[PDB]
Amino acid sequence: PIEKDRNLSMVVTTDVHYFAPSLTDNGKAFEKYVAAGDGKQLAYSDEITDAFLADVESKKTDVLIISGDLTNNGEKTSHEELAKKLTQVEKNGTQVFVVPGNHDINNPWARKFEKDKQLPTDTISPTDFSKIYSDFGYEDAISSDEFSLSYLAAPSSKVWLLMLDTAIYKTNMQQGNPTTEGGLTAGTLDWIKESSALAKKNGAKLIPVLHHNLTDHNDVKGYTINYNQQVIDALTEGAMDFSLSGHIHTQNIRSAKSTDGKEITDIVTNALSVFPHKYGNITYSAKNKNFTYQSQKLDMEAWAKAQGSTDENLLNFDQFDYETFYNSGYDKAMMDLMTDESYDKYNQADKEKMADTMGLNNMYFFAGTAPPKSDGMALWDSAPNSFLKDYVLSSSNPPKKSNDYYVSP
Numbered sequence: 030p031i032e033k034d035r036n037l038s039m040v041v042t043t044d045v046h047y048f049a050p051s052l053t054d055n056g057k058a059f060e061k062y063v064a065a066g067d068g069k070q071l072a073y074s075d076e077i078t079d080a081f082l083a084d085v086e087s088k089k090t091d092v093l094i095i096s097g098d099l100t101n102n103g104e105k106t107s108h109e110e111l112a113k114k115l116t117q118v119e120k121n122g123t124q125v126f127v128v129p130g131n132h133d134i135n136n137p138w139a140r141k142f143e144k145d146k147q148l149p150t151d152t153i154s155p156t157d158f159s160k161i162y163s164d165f166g167y168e169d170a171i172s173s174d175e176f177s178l179s180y181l182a183a184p185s186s187k188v189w190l191l192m193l194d195t196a197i198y199k200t201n202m203q204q205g206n207p208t209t210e211g212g213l214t215a216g217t218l219d220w221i222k223e224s225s226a227l228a229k230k231n232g233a234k235l236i237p238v239l240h241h242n243l244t245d246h247n248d249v250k251g252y253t254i255n256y257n258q259q260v261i262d263a264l265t266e267g268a269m270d271f272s273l274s275g276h277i278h279t280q281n282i283r284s285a286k287s288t289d290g291k292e293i294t295d296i297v298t299n300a301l302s303v304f305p306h307k308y309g310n311i312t313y314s315a316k317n318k319n320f321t322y323q324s325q326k327l328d329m330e331a332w333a334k335a336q337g338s339t340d341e342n343l344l345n346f347d348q349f350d351y352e353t354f355y356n357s358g359y360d361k362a363m364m365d366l367m368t369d370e371s372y373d374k375y376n377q378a379d380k381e382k383m384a385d386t387m388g389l390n391n392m393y394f395f396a397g398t399a400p401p402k403s404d405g406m407a408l409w410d411s412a413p414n415s416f417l418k419d420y421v422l423s424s425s426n427p428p429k430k431s432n433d434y435y436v437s438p
């Protein structure tokens with residue numbers, strides 16, 4: 030614990046969706062899987078994760094936070110390998126804190142790939158999670174919630190972390206699928222209040238971290254936490270000005286109001302596994318007692334070159350990733366345009382313009398920045414009603430407020 034009332038350097042990431050290389054042979058089965066993984070660089074999760082941690086190390090980061098979805102599909106092996114990397118990070122002096130996401134625990138979808146077959150592989154239980162990641166928040170927690178993997182951590186004397194587990198997994202094996210939506214019981218909400226009171230007694234500011242979102246981040250369920258108003262009210266009552274969440278994967282900042290009018294800013298950092306692969310820098314000013322959040326794009330090309338890599342996709346990662354993610358949204362739209370009988374009145378060239386607009390607006394929405402003008406926009410505006418159309422339109426306008434920078438008030 031950092032007792033000195035000095036500036037604190039922090040980094041937050043989320044949705045690493047780590048997949049242990051030992052769980053795949055990069056065969057047919059794996060290729061199809063990654064193809065349907067809508068944009069996530071699953072094939073390079075090991076390199077992306079290492080590149081990221083190398084950055085944390087060079088920054089000599091005080092605190093590293095990971096807001097859920099540590100693994101692809103809760104594979105025990107992926108969890109163990111990721112834990113090994115975090116153990117090394119801690120040897121450098123950096124304190125690491127993690128919480129689970131919807132894909133991390135009791136995951137019936139845990140699979141390993143061999144040729145044209147997906148085979149079963151072990152997942153983990155809730156207590157397995159607190160055991161595997163005991164060094165990263167759990168063992169030294171100041172307080173731990175009774176029925177969730179939530180806990181209160183004190184990495185320094187002036188700044189504490191309210192690490193929340195908003196994941197729902199206790200009925201996963203019975204469902205056959207990992208629950209996507211998130212939520213907090215009244216008991217965990219009561220614990221949050223007690224925790225907030227303890228931080229206040231100790232003169233510490235508190236940063237609430239959760240996988241699911243505190244409020245909506247797109248005008249177009251299961252991503253914003255269930256019954257979010259109760260959570261917002263609980264956090265604002267604790268005097269917390271901002272929260273760090275993930276799950277939706279898009280670099281996106283939005284504010285919400287408590288029932289009594291207090292504001293809290295929900296900062297969603299880009300999924301580490303998806304374009305543009307940004308992570309968040311958070312700096313605490315001891316003198317001003319405020320927090321400054323600034324996103325940073327992971328430089329894979331620089332890491333690749335320093336590794337002496339011969340993989341062209343990594344040496345040219347910017348282009349590779351740009352194309353990979355653009356095509357994911359392009360194909361997404363084109364499939365619909367080529368299936369719905371309400372679009373056959375559009376000629377091929379137009380469907381292409383529309384697919385292009387989706388690929389552009391979509392990728393820039395994930396980057397959290399303004400999308401460039403595209404000929405497909407006019408076509409979408411007059412196109413038939415649909416969720417897709419709503420999304421394309423809702424992401425056609427420039428962000429009215431930065432999704433990359435925030436300073437607490």
Ligand SMILES: [Ca+2]
Binds near residue numbers: 119125164166
């Ligand atoms: Ca530790």
Ligand SMILES: [Fe+3]
Binds near residue numbers: 130131276
């Ligand atoms: Fe998630």
Ligand SMILES: [Mn+2]
Binds near residue numbers: 046098276278300
């Ligand atoms: Mn995720």
